[PDB]
Symmetry: D2
Subunit: 314 residues, 4 copies
């Protein structure tokens, strides 16, 4: 009986994401928000033979009605990358977007799970947290930076190289969601896999640059949409399952953390009825993986401070 | 184990359809075709953690490679309606698209199952058949006009009026896929439902004009995409299941038919390893439903001849 | 000091057309209307260092304000063709667009010159006329189906074949604006040009199919925009010159006509202070050109009745 | 006689710019380049009844054919701003675009005038210069950062405030093209105008933020396109006129400079057959203007350095 809001539902990620959500028997009400096209998207989806009641909402005047009574809010809203851009180049525009939408969440559904897809996640989660603090309703167990696509990619790339079924591969990925902050823990992969250091370095590099690879491949027509819809759907379903009392639900996500000196960090999280049940931590890692964690912390701290400083000027 | 081609994979229907197919454990290879953007879409989808190998093809030169060894070909390729248009306003453009694509199918994967989504279906299926006849490889048990969205809509609308779960509702829909040729057999609905004639006529009208309702809702941004992807995926999965040896698989579809005076007609079909195993026919219908069939036949025969005459001029 | 309104100013034709008008010393006020994006287009254009005052209007509330006091209204509003479509395939969408916009013109600037670009012109001019008749303000000397791009094309193609300066070439084009109804009168060209038959036939066909040529070349990204903006601007400037009292201003345009049995027809028109001063008629033509007129008449009459019937269904 | 290449001809600026160039009797050959849509744009423009021969080129394989024999190359190519973005956010994308395109210019038409519109101009001109240096063909009198839109805006705003014909207004604008580096010299305006400091400050701020104002007004639909096409065309025509031997042609442009400590800077330039004939310098300025110059130099220096360092990484 989960009530889910999608903010940015008319965009490239938002539409196929809303489809996957509508198709699931976990969702009872699907409220869609954007600045354009939502009524059409809602009409389209409302015809699908599943139980989820689909409602479309349009413009900041209707945003409160979209959020009212929501259990989960997913935020794919945001400007995508063009070839040559870094995720950091999107900060100025997407920071304003996230601050506005999460302010409405703080006011109208403060108890909801907030899942931010909007890049750069390393900065937009700190923004979300500070906005919630401003409204006096900050719960760090309920705010999630969606990094699930990194794990999905890692699983796929490991499966391809080792001739495995990616459905039965699980690579923990930690740190953040940008460049060298993406740290795939191949040593913790199930099933156990052994790559030589040159192949391991190549695999790790491809995981880190996978987003840019897709941006390049689309050649100006945006960034990952369909795989991001898949990964965002996976995360929401995991979260909704856990809220309904499903046990053993573990997902990596960029959250308020005390695992490192970084105040926000991605690690495997046991999810439960109140959101984050337990942060399962970094765990035992190789020297190579330790080196990556060390190199990533400087950029993570910088991205975090950037997001915090943006909210200070509001 | 199925090898599925999606012709028009970069379009509004094509992209979410390709996503749903990539997510399926029934698909082992997914080849995508379009005249633009296919490499970007293929790169996007290839990151998803499922077994299906994804490959993107671009331009008519690469169309043969896309079709090589395919088991099922799905054709969402086509121009969508704008508000005010009838499906027949798309005839000239989509007839040419279907004629070109199905000609490539006849040459390069004649044994494959051909699922045509491109509208107007009442003419484009006749076009497909005549193209296959011209190449001397016409198998009427393997060419399908996808009407599944009509059934999906009928199930949803009946479920909403009776307060049922759409997953437990099954409404046979017969005839064709345009206006009054869409004939929902509410008298054969499982479970049995009783409407007074005024509500039954309103429900019947809603099902018939649902496509136009979505076009009006999208207000220039195309026609049904996400619900059509769902409906298209449903039909493909039913078909692939039946091909692997699943029993009792029944789907309505616009096909070569001897059930009425129309040479092509939509009825529930028992699917199997060779495609259509048995046409289950119209069955017993109400007087109201009998009148709808009688009134639809002239339009169906007209649309069929229009498609046949188009191929005849080529 | 002309006041010009552009209805559909945010579209593919509208924006470059608006630029050309803003750049002209003949325009003192430029009012722009559309259902989206107009404020941004007006803001952009308002920075240009010419005298024309630019104002952007958005939505039905503001449409009357755009039209009040206008000398000329240009209506590029309408959906463009995709490859394989005929101009007639756009009728059912563009008919309502033209009906709505010309009704506002009839109410708010009935004395203005009404220049309809929206296709299919052979049907949308009849619509415009009947709308003006319904409002009791029909002046056939002020309603113009813009065929100017046919003449511009003919001039270019003749000039290229003969190696002439296209600025010194003038080819009358008569009939209508769709395929075989486009009748270039190469026999009346200035300077007089003599082509061998095979070149003459190829030239004539190229002129007739030029729009489809551009649609093909654009491969789904619409139809002629930049050259249509040029041609539309040329026609407006000719109208304004004539309104300012310039002598001998001649333009072909699709207008109410008694030159043939067709109630609307394009011929060279002497323009004056009140619009059409004198219809100069078909004049002396060749046998090849006479046969083209004969072939065009049935299609034109069909297109005209289609537009007339549409208004009668309202 | 002038052969002009437009690199980025299919974009928002490129299309209307190409139209204005096609319309000009100063242009005899027009070559259009982009990575998509160019064939359609070229076909469209090739129908216009002016002498300029139009040809379209698609993809890096055809870029050399586009550039050979060119007298002037204009580069509007580049990603536009979204609301929130600074021009600096576009650096990474547009730097790569400019680096690639200007490398091709240095290889295939090193004698051509190079007019860079792509922002941030304060960095992309340094990129252009260094790329030409690498190929041993650097001519600083032929490389221009197009700042003309700032002058066009200043003229319009001054004219509007004083009720003047903007055609008779001329405001020199110096420095660069980004925020506080845009320095309008109102003290050197012709005709002489007098504003109180409060008005002068607001007018000055209005000119500096004009680009951001349009981005806001377009609300996500890009940045200035039509006015930039006007301003780009103006500059190209001034340059081509000067190349034809017209005397007294003066335009402000961001060029290699020794007028200040900045190695690149915008001031009024006397144009001629060699490109830059003479740099006319800053001239006599007010205290207010002197202060703006002092405050801008640090940012200009950083932008120049940033561009130079980028080329080192290639």
């Amino acid at each position: 009986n989960a009530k889910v809001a999608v903010l940015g539902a008319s965009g490239g990620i938002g539409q196929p994401l809303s489809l996957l959500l509508k198709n699931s028997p976990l969702v009872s009400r699907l409220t869609l928000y954007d600045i354009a096209h939502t009524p059409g998207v809602a009409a389209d989806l409302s015809h699908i033979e599943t139980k989820a009641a689909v409602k479309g909402y349009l413009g900041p005047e209707q945003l409160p009605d979209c959020l009212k009574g929501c259990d989960v809010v997913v935020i794919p809203a945001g400007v995508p990358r063009k070839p040559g851009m870094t995720r950091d180049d999107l900060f100025n525009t997407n920071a304003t977007i996230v601050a506005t939408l999460t302010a409405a969440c703080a006011q109208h559904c403060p108890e909801a799970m907030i899942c931010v897809i909007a890049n750069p996640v390393n900065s937009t989660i700190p923004i979300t947290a500070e906005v919630f603090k401003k409204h006096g309703v900050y719960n760090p167990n309920k705010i999630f930076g969606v990094t699930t696509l990194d794990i999905v990619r890692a699983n796929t790339f490991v499966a391809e190289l080792k001739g495995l079924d990616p459905a039965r591969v699980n690579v923990p990925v930690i740190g953040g969601h940008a460049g060298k902050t993406i740290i795939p823990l191949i040593s913790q992969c199930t099933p156990k896999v052994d790559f030589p250091q040159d192949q391991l370095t190549a695999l790790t590099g491809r995981i880190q640059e996978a987003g840019t690879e897709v941006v390049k491949a689309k050649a100006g027509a945006g960034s990952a949409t369909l795989s991001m819809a898949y990964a965002g759907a996976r995360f929401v379903f995991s979260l909704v399952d856990a809220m309904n009392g499903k046990e053993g639900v573990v997902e990596c996500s960029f959250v308020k953390s005390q695992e490192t000196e970084c105040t926000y960090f991605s690690t495997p999280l046991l999810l439960g009825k109140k959101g984050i049940e337990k942060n399962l931590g970094i765990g035992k890692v190789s020297s190579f993986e330790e080196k990556m964690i060390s190199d990533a912390i400087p950029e993570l701290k910088a991205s975090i401070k950037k997001g915090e400083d943006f909210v200070k000027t509001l």
